[PDB]
Design an enzyme around this catalytic site. Structure first.
Site, PDB file in Angstrom:
ATOM      1  N   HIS A  45      46.500  20.509  -6.344  1.00  0.00           N
ATOM      2  CA  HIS A  45      45.242  21.102  -5.561  1.00  0.00           C
ATOM      3  C   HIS A  45      44.116  19.913  -5.380  1.00  0.00           C
ATOM      4  O   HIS A  45      43.260  20.128  -4.456  1.00  0.00           O
ATOM      5  CB  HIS A  45      44.678  22.227  -6.249  1.00  0.00           C
ATOM      6  CG  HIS A  45      43.881  22.036  -7.515  1.00  0.00           C
ATOM      7  ND1 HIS A  45      44.459  22.231  -8.551  1.00  0.00           N
ATOM      8  CD2 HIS A  45      42.536  21.581  -7.582  1.00  0.00           C
ATOM      9  CE1 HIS A  45      43.309  21.936  -9.428  1.00  0.00           C
ATOM     10  NE2 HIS A  45      42.152  21.782  -8.701  1.00  0.00           N
ATOM     11  N   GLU A  59      37.765   3.570 -16.114  1.00  0.00           N
ATOM     12  CA  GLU A  59      36.443   3.975 -15.981  1.00  0.00           C
ATOM     13  C   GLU A  59      36.145   4.764 -17.181  1.00  0.00           C
ATOM     14  O   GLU A  59      36.646   5.623 -17.723  1.00  0.00           O
ATOM     15  CB  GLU A  59      36.602   4.846 -14.724  1.00  0.00           C
ATOM     16  CG  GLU A  59      35.185   5.730 -14.314  1.00  0.00           C
ATOM     17  CD  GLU A  59      34.183   4.509 -14.077  1.00  0.00           C
ATOM     18  OE1 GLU A  59      33.823   4.210 -14.799  1.00  0.00           O
ATOM     19  OE2 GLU A  59      33.897   4.534 -12.694  1.00  0.00           O
ATOM     20  N   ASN A  61      31.827   5.223 -17.433  1.00  0.00           N
ATOM     21  CA  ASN A  61      30.634   5.933 -16.682  1.00  0.00           C
ATOM     22  C   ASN A  61      30.813   5.805 -15.410  1.00  0.00           C
ATOM     23  O   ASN A  61      31.158   4.808 -14.788  1.00  0.00           O
ATOM     24  CB  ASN A  61      29.556   5.333 -17.425  1.00  0.00           C
ATOM     25  CG  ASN A  61      28.079   5.949 -16.989  1.00  0.00           C
ATOM     26  OD1 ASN A  61      27.908   6.495 -15.837  1.00  0.00           O
ATOM     27  ND2 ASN A  61      27.100   6.037 -17.773  1.00  0.00           N
ATOM     28  N   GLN A  64      27.889   4.014 -13.735  1.00  0.00           N
ATOM     29  CA  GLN A  64      27.069   2.763 -14.197  1.00  0.00           C
ATOM     30  C   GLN A  64      28.516   1.757 -14.506  1.00  0.00           C
ATOM     31  O   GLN A  64      29.570   2.053 -14.550  1.00  0.00           O
ATOM     32  CB  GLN A  64      26.573   2.878 -15.737  1.00  0.00           C
ATOM     33  CG  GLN A  64      25.328   3.327 -15.730  1.00  0.00           C
ATOM     34  CD  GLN A  64      24.823   3.535 -17.404  1.00  0.00           C
ATOM     35  OE1 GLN A  64      23.818   3.850 -17.493  1.00  0.00           O
ATOM     36  NE2 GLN A  64      25.556   2.955 -18.244  1.00  0.00           N
ATOM     37  N   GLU A  69      36.474  -1.405 -15.007  1.00  0.00           N
ATOM     38  CA  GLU A  69      37.093  -0.559 -13.874  1.00  0.00           C
ATOM     39  C   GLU A  69      38.067  -1.260 -13.023  1.00  0.00           C
ATOM     40  O   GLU A  69      37.929  -2.297 -12.777  1.00  0.00           O
ATOM     41  CB  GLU A  69      36.010   0.010 -12.905  1.00  0.00           C
ATOM     42  CG  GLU A  69      35.064   0.945 -13.776  1.00  0.00           C
ATOM     43  CD  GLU A  69      33.740   0.109 -14.141  1.00  0.00           C
ATOM     44  OE1 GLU A  69      33.868  -0.985 -14.632  1.00  0.00           O
ATOM     45  OE2 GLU A  69      32.639   0.797 -14.251  1.00  0.00           O
ATOM     46  N   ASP A  93      51.303  23.135  -9.744  1.00  0.00           N
ATOM     47  CA  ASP A  93      50.287  22.245  -9.414  1.00  0.00           C
ATOM     48  C   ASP A  93      50.378  20.827 -10.255  1.00  0.00           C
ATOM     49  O   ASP A  93      49.675  20.680 -11.021  1.00  0.00           O
ATOM     50  CB  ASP A  93      48.660  23.160  -9.968  1.00  0.00           C
ATOM     51  CG  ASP A  93      47.556  22.542  -9.412  1.00  0.00           C
ATOM     52  OD1 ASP A  93      47.751  21.741  -8.325  1.00  0.00           O
ATOM     53  OD2 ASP A  93      46.532  22.927  -9.918  1.00  0.00           O
ATOM     54  N   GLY A 186      36.208  19.473 -11.367  1.00  0.00           N
ATOM     55  CA  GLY A 186      35.943  18.083 -11.596  1.00  0.00           C
ATOM     56  C   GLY A 186      36.900  17.537 -12.704  1.00  0.00           C
ATOM     57  O   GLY A 186      37.161  16.520 -12.579  1.00  0.00           O
ATOM     58  N   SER A 188      39.756  18.985 -13.049  1.00  0.00           N
ATOM     59  CA  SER A 188      41.129  19.253 -12.505  1.00  0.00           C
ATOM     60  C   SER A 188      41.987  17.956 -12.192  1.00  0.00           C
ATOM     61  O   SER A 188      41.654  17.020 -11.965  1.00  0.00           O
ATOM     62  CB  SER A 188      40.868  19.853 -10.902  1.00  0.00           C
ATOM     63  OG  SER A 188      40.527  21.071 -11.037  1.00  0.00           O
ATOM     64  N   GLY A 189      43.366  18.154 -12.287  1.00  0.00           N
ATOM     65  CA  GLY A 189      44.170  16.910 -12.261  1.00  0.00           C
ATOM     66  C   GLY A 189      44.249  15.914 -13.547  1.00  0.00           C
ATOM     67  O   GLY A 189      45.315  15.526 -13.519  1.00  0.00           O
TER      68      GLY A 189
END
Ligand SMILES: [Cl-]
Length: 240
Positions: A45, A59, A61, A64, A69, A93, A186, A188-189
């Site tokens: 989804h 990642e 923050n 910032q 990253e 899903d 947020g 999700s996944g």
């Protein structure tokens, strides 16, 4: 993650941020799990929209510079063929993202360990959900990666009438439901990391929470059961 605590920077190195391009910037929309240097496991989804997606590994923050990253485009998206956006309760899903480049592994960027196929956790098994999702129902994304302790709720209990009923399937993992801590939009996944035989493995892909709210008692966060899709995942990676 509602009722979470800030994760240490190197605790969950397979956690990624799946972002979409918005104007001249990027917005976090979902989590995911790095499973190969060039493959991410996330929720189907999350990639329903026809957006430009990128993955951020290492990642911590979102707002910032962490100095760790790595930003990589998504080159191919393979959604489970039985996924139906109109029916999250049907399950399936899950989606795999082939990254445009292979990321570099380090203490912040590692492959998520997946459970062996068919593994089911005993009720009340210790797990942590992680993510940058909303920190409150109808809230805002976290800046820093959060973690919340969410013990599993087995299928029998989860699919009972006072929990999720028939909405939950045996292809899913439920966790939490205490009314304080949960996944939220947020997240999700992303992963559900559960400690088994001394090692954390990613047993769930965050899929849904109640329409009533994120942290709703007896509405544990529901995840795609990773162990139901091991063959699928392998088949996708082998043919792509
Ligand atoms: Cl991890």
């Amino acid at each position: 993650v509602v009722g979470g605590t800030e994760a240490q920077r190197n605790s969950w190195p397979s956690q990624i941020s799946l972002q979409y391009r918005s104007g001249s910037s990027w917005a976090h929309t979902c989590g995911g799990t790095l499973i190969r240097q060039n493959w991410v496991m996330t929720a189907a989804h999350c990639v329903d929209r026809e957006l430009t997606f990128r993955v951020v590994v290492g990642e911590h923050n979102l707002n910032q510079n962490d100095g760790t990253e790595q930003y990589v485009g998504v080159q191919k998206i393979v959604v489970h063929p039985y996924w139906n956006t109109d029916d999250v309760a049907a399950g399936y899903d899950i989606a795999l993202l082939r990254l445009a480049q292979s990321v570099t592994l380090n203490s912040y960027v590692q492959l998520g360990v997946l459970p062996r196929a068919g593994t089911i956790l005993a009720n009340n098994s210790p797990c942590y959900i992680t993510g940058w999702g909303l920190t409150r129902t109808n809230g805002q994304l976290a800046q820093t990666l959060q973690q919340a302790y969410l013990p599993t709720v087995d299928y029998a209990i989860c699919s009972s009438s006072s929990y999720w009923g028939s909405t939950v399937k045996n292809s899913m993992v439920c966790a939490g439901g205490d009314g304080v801590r949960s996944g939220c939009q947020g997240d999700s996944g992303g992963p559900l990391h559960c400690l088994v035989n001394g090692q954390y493995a990613v047993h769930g892909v965050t899929s849904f929470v109640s329409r009533l709210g994120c942290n709703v008692t007896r509405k544990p966060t529901v995840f795609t059961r990773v162990s139901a899709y091991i063959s699928w995942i392998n088949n996708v990676i082998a043919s792509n």
